Amino acid sequence: GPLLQRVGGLDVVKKVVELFYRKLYADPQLIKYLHDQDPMHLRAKQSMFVSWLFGPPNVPYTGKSVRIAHLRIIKQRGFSPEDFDLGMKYFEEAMTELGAPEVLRGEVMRRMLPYKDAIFTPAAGD
Numbered sequence: 001g002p003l004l005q006r007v008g009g010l011d012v013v014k015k016v017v018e019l020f021y022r023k024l025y026a027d028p029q030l031i032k033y034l035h036d037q038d039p040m041h042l043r044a045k046q047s048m049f050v051s052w053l054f055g056p057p058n059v060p061y062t063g064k065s066v067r068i069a070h071l072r073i074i075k076q077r078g079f080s081p082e083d084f085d086l087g088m089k090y091f092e093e094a095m096t097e098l099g100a101p102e103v104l105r106g107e108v109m110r111r112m113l114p115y116k117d118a119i120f121t122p123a124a125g126d
């Protein structure tokens with residue numbers, strides 16, 4: 001049934017996100033963007049998105065614009081689509097390492113994929 005149960009419940013989601021952030025901060029290309037970001041604060045800010053991500057299907061995300069959220073590191077530090085790809089690799093690795101099957105991982109990653117274009121497509125108002 002629901003994605004949250006299928007992946008193994010809220011304890012698994014928590015550990016996926018924590019492993020995701022461990023991988024992020026250990027990466028020498030992404031640390032440029034994170035060394036001055038409190039990892040606990042960042043996870044807190046990302047929580048609404050993660051709650052939507054493992055929530056009911058089809059519901060559109062209505063939280064803060066992800067381009068706006070990342071626009072400082074884009075303009076000031078060159079955060080690029082290739083850095084976002086690495087982030088998505090690490091989120092997928094975290095799900096794999098905690099035992100989530102590929103069919104579940106593909107479902108989750110397909111929900112996340114549109115947010116690459118969201119972050120990096122210029123919009124009036126930047």
Ligand code: HEM
Pocket residue numbers: 024030033034037042045046048049050063064065066068069070073083084085086087088091112115
């Ligand atoms: C790959 C390396 C990544 C870096 C360096 C990074 C960096 C950041 C930073 C610095 C913020 C802080 C924005 C703020 O506090 O105003 C943020 C917020 C956020 N990022 Fe990322 N990010 C990465 C990948 C991702 C990925 C893969 C996603 C998946 C969708 C994502 C989704 C979000 C969300 C939802 C927020 C919170 C927006 C809000 O405040 O509601 N980020 N990110």
Ligand SMILES: [C-]#N
Pocket residue numbers: 042043046
């Ligand atoms: C992005 N955390």
